[PDB]
Ligand binder design. Structure first.
Ligand code: HKU
Ligand code: ZN
Ligand code: ZN
Ligand code: ZN
Length: 231
């Protein structure tokens, strides 16, 4: 079964095999006296690995690399951060020190710099307009439009029909909006609809935080965001 906070002490990282050659990584972080789980993705690319997002912080990300080497034993050669917040770029310095080539859109790199966060080395072209998609090794990167943040990307694994939504997609247990300080509430439902239109065949949907589900998570997120809009 999918791990929860009570199964993961902060500092430790779990891997969960979603499908052949596709894992999520799960870590925990404390924020304001509460503990949050956070998901990222690992995708096999031949005899290498592609990492999607850090494990939210330097210590967690170092533990992530150690757990990957222990359990999978293939090199993480590239990493993609799906937006500029700390749970996604926090640990980029650890990845870079370990020899991982780090990537983000130029929109993400700029916003991370303004926030004083860690900055991925490389810039991903072809993702500047809503609906843009590019292949990056074994995944497709998709910019659906502004949602949780103006730069948020989602990631699809075509071989496994796995959609990783990052923080633009909420788990079913989340009934109210999370951090929306940098969100475009007005555009978020339209952006989610672009995801649905582009990946209608998705079989596994991974939210940024919490339990995987199916495409139901998209309309659930839209409902939560619209209700917050009308608060
Ligand atoms: C739920 C809040 C506090 N959060 C923490 C990290 N990421 C988020 C988010 O909403 O995306
Ligand atoms: Zn965020
Ligand atoms: Zn987040
Ligand atoms: Zn719901």
């Amino acid at each position: 079964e999918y791990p929860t906070v009570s199964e993961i002490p902060v500092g430790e990282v779990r891997l969960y095999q979603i499908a052949d050659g596709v894992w999520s990584h799960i870590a925990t972080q404390s924020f304001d006296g509460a503990v949050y789980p956070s998901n990222g993705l690992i995708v096999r690319d031949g005899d290498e690995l592609l990492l999607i997002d850090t494990a939210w912080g330097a210590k967690n990300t170092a533990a992530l690399l150690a757990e990957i080497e222990k359990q999978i034993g293939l090199p993480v050669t590239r990493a993609v951060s799906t937006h500029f917040h700390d749970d996604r770029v926090g640990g980029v310095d650890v990845l870079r020190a370990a020899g991982v080539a780090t990537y983000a859109s130029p929109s993400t790199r700029r916003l991370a710099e303004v926030e004083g966060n860690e900055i991925p080395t490389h810039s991903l072209e072809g993702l500047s307009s809503s609906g843009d998609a590019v292949r990056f090794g074994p995944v497709e990167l998709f910019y659906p439009g502004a949602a949780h943040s103006t730069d948020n990307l989602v990631v699809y694994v075509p071989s496994a029909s796995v959609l990783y939504g990052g923080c633009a997609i909420y788990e079913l247990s989340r009934t109210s909006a999370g951090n929306v300080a940098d969100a475009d509430l007005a555009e978020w439902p339209t952006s989610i609809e672009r995801i649905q239109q582009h990946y209608p065949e998705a079989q596994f949907v991974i939210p940024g935080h919490g339990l995987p589900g199916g495409l139901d998570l998209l309309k659930h997120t839209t409902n939560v965001v619209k209700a917050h809009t009308n608060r």
